[PDB]
Design a protein around this ligand. Structure first.
Ligand SMILES: [Ca+2]
Ligand SMILES: [Ca+2]
Ligand SMILES: [Ca+2]
Lengths: 163, 12
């Protein structure tokens, strides 16, 4: 998903986030950049899900930092060459706020809140209930109250190309 | 379509 120019450019940008003492190639490939530095990058700073994006691409058990390889994975998924299948798969992981494998009413509520902003312009209790009910009506095929991956990939594939 | 808007917010 990334060209060689993109990988080499990514390494130079990644290294600018490290202390001077960790900028050798070997040190840089062992380094873990905390989210605070990642969340300020132009590619992420304006993204409403930046905090969820960091978490999903982190490979450390504490899910609180990004390695260079994790950072290449993030760029790979957000590149213009990434397939519709991979984008909807990672979108599902990003929207799964509690990380339990399905999108429930709480996940959908947090997703809507991300789209509007924390609050003023926040949706009211009634507006949120009506929106979530409508989302579930279109997406939850087996009617068990949650949206699993296949339901999600199916609903996305039937939507216009967000290109 | 709600999902179009949410994917555009994420990948746009
Ligand atoms: Ca839960
Ligand atoms: Ca969940
Ligand atoms: Ca379901």
């Amino acid at each position: 998903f990334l060209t060689k120019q993109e990988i080499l450019l990514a390494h130079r940008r990644f290294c600018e986030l490290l202390p001077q003492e960790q900028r050798s190639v070997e040190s840089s490939l062992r380094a873990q950049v905390p989210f605070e530095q990642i969340l300020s990058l132009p590619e992420l700073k304006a993204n409403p899900f930046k905090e969820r994006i960091c978490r999903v691409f982190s490979t450390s058990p504490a899910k609180d930092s990004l390695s260079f390889e994790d950072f290449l994975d993030l760029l790979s998924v957000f590149s213009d060459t990434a397939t519709p299948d991979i984008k909807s798969h990672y979108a599902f992981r990003i929207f799964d706020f509690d990380d339990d494998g399905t999108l429930n009413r709480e996940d959908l509520s947090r997703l809507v809140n991300c789209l509007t902003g924390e609050g003023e312009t926040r949706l009211s209790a009634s507006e949120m209930k009506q929106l979530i009910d409508n989302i579930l009506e279109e997406s939850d095929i087996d009617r068990d109250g949650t949206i699993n991956l296949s339901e999600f990939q199916h609903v996305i594939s039937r939507s216009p190309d967000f290109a | 379509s709600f999902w179009y808007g949410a994917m555009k917010a994420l990948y746009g």
